[PDB]
Design an enzyme around this catalytic site. Structure first.
Site, PDB file in Angstrom:
ATOM      1  N   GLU B 177       0.797  -1.237   0.000  1.00 12.38           N
ATOM      2  CA  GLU B 177       0.000   0.000   0.000  1.00 12.38           C
ATOM      3  C   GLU B 177       0.831   1.290   0.000  1.00 12.38           C
ATOM      4  O   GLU B 177       0.256   2.332  -0.129  1.00 12.38           O
ATOM      5  CB  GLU B 177      -0.943   0.078   1.205  1.00 12.38           C
ATOM      6  CG  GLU B 177      -2.257  -0.649   1.012  1.00 12.38           C
ATOM      7  CD  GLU B 177      -2.065  -2.123   0.644  1.00 12.38           C
ATOM      8  OE1 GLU B 177      -1.801  -2.910   1.592  1.00 12.38           O
ATOM      9  OE2 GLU B 177      -2.111  -2.472  -0.584  1.00 12.38           O
ATOM     10  N   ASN B 261      -0.359  -8.179  -3.616  1.00 13.50           N
ATOM     11  CA  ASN B 261      -0.942  -7.365  -4.657  1.00 13.50           C
ATOM     12  C   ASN B 261       0.026  -6.371  -5.274  1.00 13.50           C
ATOM     13  O   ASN B 261       0.909  -5.894  -4.599  1.00 13.50           O
ATOM     14  CB  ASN B 261      -2.138  -6.573  -4.115  1.00 13.50           C
ATOM     15  CG  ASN B 261      -1.744  -5.627  -3.001  1.00 13.50           C
ATOM     16  OD1 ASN B 261      -1.224  -6.057  -1.964  1.00 13.50           O
ATOM     17  ND2 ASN B 261      -2.077  -4.333  -3.154  1.00 13.50           N
ATOM     18  N   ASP B 303      -7.186  -5.488  -5.126  1.00 16.75           N
ATOM     19  CA  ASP B 303      -6.366  -5.770  -3.967  1.00 16.75           C
ATOM     20  C   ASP B 303      -6.716  -7.109  -3.333  1.00 16.75           C
ATOM     21  O   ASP B 303      -6.965  -7.164  -2.141  1.00 16.75           O
ATOM     22  CB  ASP B 303      -6.491  -4.645  -2.921  1.00 16.75           C
ATOM     23  CG  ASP B 303      -5.574  -4.861  -1.673  1.00 16.75           C
ATOM     24  OD1 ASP B 303      -4.481  -5.332  -1.845  1.00 16.75           O
ATOM     25  OD2 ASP B 303      -5.982  -4.619  -0.512  1.00 16.75           O
TER      26      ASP B 303
HETATM   27  O1  LIG Z   1       0.379  -4.737   0.927  1.00 14.94           O
HETATM   28  C1  LIG Z   1       0.820  -5.136   2.008  1.00 14.94           C
HETATM   29  O2  LIG Z   1       2.059  -5.443   2.054  1.00 14.94           O
HETATM   30  C2  LIG Z   1      -0.109  -5.447   3.159  1.00 14.94           C
HETATM   31  C3  LIG Z   1       0.357  -5.544   4.455  1.00 14.94           C
HETATM   32  C4  LIG Z   1      -0.505  -5.923   5.529  1.00 14.94           C
HETATM   33  C5  LIG Z   1       0.131  -6.070   6.908  1.00 14.94           C
HETATM   34  O3  LIG Z   1       1.392  -5.951   6.981  1.00 14.94           O
HETATM   35  O4  LIG Z   1      -0.480  -6.451   7.949  1.00 14.94           O
HETATM   36  C6  LIG Z   1      -1.875  -6.193   5.157  1.00 14.94           C
HETATM   37  C7  LIG Z   1      -2.246  -6.037   3.797  1.00 14.94           C
HETATM   38  N1  LIG Z   1      -1.375  -5.692   2.856  1.00 14.94           N
HETATM   39  C8  LIG Z   1      -3.574  -6.334   3.343  1.00 14.94           C
HETATM   40  O5  LIG Z   1      -3.981  -6.307   2.017  1.00 14.94           O
HETATM   41  C9  LIG Z   1      -4.508  -6.786   4.236  1.00 14.94           C
HETATM   42  O6  LIG Z   1      -5.774  -7.111   3.788  1.00 14.94           O
HETATM   43  C10 LIG Z   1      -4.193  -6.890   5.582  1.00 14.94           C
HETATM   44  C11 LIG Z   1      -5.004  -7.275   6.684  1.00 14.94           C
HETATM   45  C12 LIG Z   1      -4.146  -7.185   7.765  1.00 14.94           C
HETATM   46  C13 LIG Z   1      -4.548  -7.638   9.121  1.00 14.94           C
HETATM   47  O7  LIG Z   1      -3.642  -8.195   9.761  1.00 14.94           O
HETATM   48  O8  LIG Z   1      -5.732  -7.711   9.481  1.00 14.94           O
HETATM   49  N2  LIG Z   1      -2.943  -6.833   7.390  1.00 14.94           N
HETATM   50  C14 LIG Z   1      -2.906  -6.605   6.068  1.00 14.94           C
HETATM   51 CA   LIG Z   2      -2.417  -5.225   0.229  1.00 10.64          CA
END
Ligand SMILES: O=C(O)c1cc(C(=O)O)c2c(n1)C(=O)C(=O)c1cc(C(=O)O)[nH]c1-2
Ligand SMILES: [Ca+2]
Lengths: 71, 573
Positions: B177, B261, B303
């Site tokens: 992100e 993603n 995503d």
């Molecule tokens: O693009 C990324 O590298 C990234 C990192 C993280 C994260 O580090 O917890 C999440 C997401 N994306 C993501 O798409 C996501 O739905 C998500 C849910 C959570 C959570 O722990 O509930 N982390 C993350």
């Molecule tokens: Ca993500």
């Protein structure tokens, strides 16, 4: 664009109707600053060099030291 | 690591988050079973000393429980013969600015362990949010080594647990992100020395590919695609971070995981298949060289970050016993591949409302897209199932090999989505879409489902008020345990889905339950401490329904049920 028509094995992207082949010079040109683009990779190179300092120092002394200025 | 594998077959131990190298999350213990779980009581508890989301779960090895927390990622060890005392503690000093570049709460998916050997003493491994991998002495908590993996100034964090194989520990990545280009790294466990590093995008040398890469399925794509499926240099900020879970087959000497993603969320800014984001990998353990790579979601528009767990199993495919991987992706498909060749065996919808895709064509490997549920600049796309949260997220699920069923916590969340143009600046968010999220067509936000992964047959399905986020545990007692975002731990009969037991924990659960034996008695443990993505609204006091990347509006009722918390609960008969 349904994902099934392939230029090449593993390459099936087509523009959606009305959208361009290439974004460079279009109204959706992302116009990325190549200096911003390269920042990640330079910060990685600097993390790797500090890490290799810490490894060599553990090899030389038998004692782990994180802070590279105390080496 | 063959010694670690061996400890994992001992029911006194829970040695890795996934329980074992096949990520079965399945226990042979039967003291607690479908006919007496109604009598399960709280035996003892601990506080973690923090708030925010508590993901992953405790580890137990050789009579010691290990506990970990969200930022600043404190670690504690507790001798199970003296549950009130902390044997040792480790308290990281981390830059508080690490919090500001975490997309989705300051969660941490937990510790890894390796037993003593030539390297030499038993170690606990911790990934810190600030990008460091740390090796601790398992008996004393003394810091043995510490290395920098990721740089928070680039919006690059760690949330995924480390993963030990042979004399290596693997460290993932996070921050797609914020335009972070994904990479996984192996470090030597004695030394902390970098052994190899494999990127998700870019030139073939960075991808780290076997010369026989995708030999068995050339139609997945082979070489040059990490550049040719992007326009110019857009791959350098192209996402594919790996913050999920791994699996390992010792006999093939292969590691499996998913890359996330592509960045930004704005599809129009990055034409092309965007390989190798959204890919199921099988990589050689020693060299990291990929033997196979299957991209599930080419040119992601939603995503559906491809980081979900890999569950290994051995099942009959057309009358032949075949080594498999099963993988419930964010995109709402459940994938099962031959884990030796990478060949596709099945890809079926976790729920019939998935609409971005009509079906996956099993012979081409290609998902047939429905343009009515595409995303694109200058369009507000309406009613896309699943939403960016997925029909499945970071929970580790479970497999009963007697029944041949996977049990899964499922989400039922749909969205509207419109992109917008934006510049990339290193260290800032790089999202580029505005979303609204809401319940799927069946009207609730979660489900729990039991299925056969070869045939796609749903054995049972039951509804939950909220998405089931933390994953599951299955036992030979005929029970599946799980926690809910609203703050219950629950047990269901694995033959039928019938609810046998529930208990009111203080806060919502976003990690998984564990079970272990100590001194001849079976225990179940779990974290309570809501957070993660569903919890962003309540954790950060957010009120705009499009904030928290769309999650706030969907989860606005959650805060009527749970506050923040941080505790460990242990149950027994
Ligand atoms: O693009 C990324 O590298 C990234 C990192 C993280 C994260 O580090 O917890 C999440 C997401 N994306 C993501 O798409 C996501 O739905 C998500 C849910 C959570 C959570 O722990 O509930 N982390 C993350
Ligand atoms: Ca993500």
């Amino acid at each position: 664009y349904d994902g099934t028509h392939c230029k090449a094995p593993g390459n099936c992207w087509e523009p959606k109707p009305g959208y361009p082949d290439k974004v460079a010079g279009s109204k959706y040109d992302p116009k990325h600053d190549p200096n911003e683009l390269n920042k990640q990779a330079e910060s990685i190179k600097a993390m790797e060099a500090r890490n290799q300092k810490r490894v060599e120092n553990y090899a030389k002394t038998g004692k782990f030291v994180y802070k590279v200025e105390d080496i | 690591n063959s010694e670690l594998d061996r400890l994992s077959k001992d029911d006194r131990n829970w040695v890795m988050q996934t329980k074992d190298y096949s990520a079965t999350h399945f226990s042979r213990l039967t003291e607690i079973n479908s006919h007496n779980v109604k009598n399960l009581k709280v035996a003892w508890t601990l506080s973690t000393g923090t708030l925010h989301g508590h993901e992953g779960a405790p580890l137990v090895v050789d009579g010691i429980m290990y506990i970990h927390t969200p930022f600043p990622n404190n670690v504690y060890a507790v001798d199970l013969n003296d549950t009130r005392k902390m044997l040792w503690q480790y308290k990281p000093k981390q830059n508080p600015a690490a919090r500001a570049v975490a997309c989705c709460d300051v969660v941490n998916r937990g510790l890894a362990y390796v037993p003593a050997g030539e390297h030499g003493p038993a170690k606990i491994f911790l990934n810190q949010l600030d990008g460091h991998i740390v090796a601790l002495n398992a008996k004393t908590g003394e810091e043995i080594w510490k290395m920098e993996n990721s740089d928070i100034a680039m919006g690059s964090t760690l949330t995924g647990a480390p993963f030990v194989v042979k004399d290596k520990v693997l460290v993932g990545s996070a921050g797609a992100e914020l335009g972070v280009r994904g990479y996984v790294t192996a470090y030597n466990i004695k030394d902390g020395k970098q052994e190899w590093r494999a990127y998700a995008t870019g030139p073939d040398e960075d991808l780290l590919l076997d010369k026989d890469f995708n030999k068995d399925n050339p139609h997945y794509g082979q070489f040059g695609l990490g550049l040719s499926t992007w326009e110019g240099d857009a791959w350098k900020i192209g996402g594919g971070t790996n913050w999920g879970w791994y699996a390992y087959d010792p006999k093939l000497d292969m590691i499996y995981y998913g890359s996330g993603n592509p960045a930004p969320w704005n599809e129009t800014m990055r034409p092309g298949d965007n390989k190798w984001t959204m890919t199921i990998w099988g990589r050689d353990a020693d060299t990291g060289r990929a033997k196979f790579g299957y991209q599930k979601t080419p040119h992601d528009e939603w995503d559906y970050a491809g980081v979900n767990y890999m569950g290994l199993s051995e099942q009959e495919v057309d009358g032949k016993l075949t080594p498999l991987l099963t993988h419930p992706d964010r995109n709402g498909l459940v994938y099962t591949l031959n884990r030796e060749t990478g060949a596709l065996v099945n890809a079926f919808k976790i729920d019939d409302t998935v609409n971005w895709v009509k079906k996956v064509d099993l012979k081409t490997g290609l998902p047939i897209r429905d343009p009515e549920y595409s995303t694109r600049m200058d369009h507000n796309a309406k009613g896309i199932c699943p939403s960016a949260m997925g029909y499945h997220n970071q929970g580790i699920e479970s497999y009963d090999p007697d029944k041949k069923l996977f049990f899964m916590g499922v989400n039922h969340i749909c969205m509207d989505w419109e992109p917008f143009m934006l510049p990339y600046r290193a260290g800032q968010f790089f999202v580029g879409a505005t979303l609204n999220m809401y319940p799927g067509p069946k009207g609730m936000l979660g489900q729990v489902k039991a299925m056969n992964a070869v045939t796609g047959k749903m054995e049972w399905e039951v509804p939950e008020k909220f998405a089931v986020w933390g994953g599951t545990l299955a036992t030979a007692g005929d029970l599946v345990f799980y926690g809910t975002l609203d703050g219950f731990i629950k047990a269901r009969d694995t033959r039928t889905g019938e609810l046998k037991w529930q208990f009111q924990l203080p806060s919502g659960v976003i990690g998984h339950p564990i079970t272990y034996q100590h001194n001849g008695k079976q225990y179940i443990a779990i974290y309570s401490g809501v957070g993660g993505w569903p919890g962003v609204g309540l954790v950060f006091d957010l009120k705009d329904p499009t904030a928290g990347l769309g999650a706030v509006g969907a989860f606005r009722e959650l805060a009527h049920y749970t506050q923040m918390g941080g505790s460990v609960f242990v149950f027994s008969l």
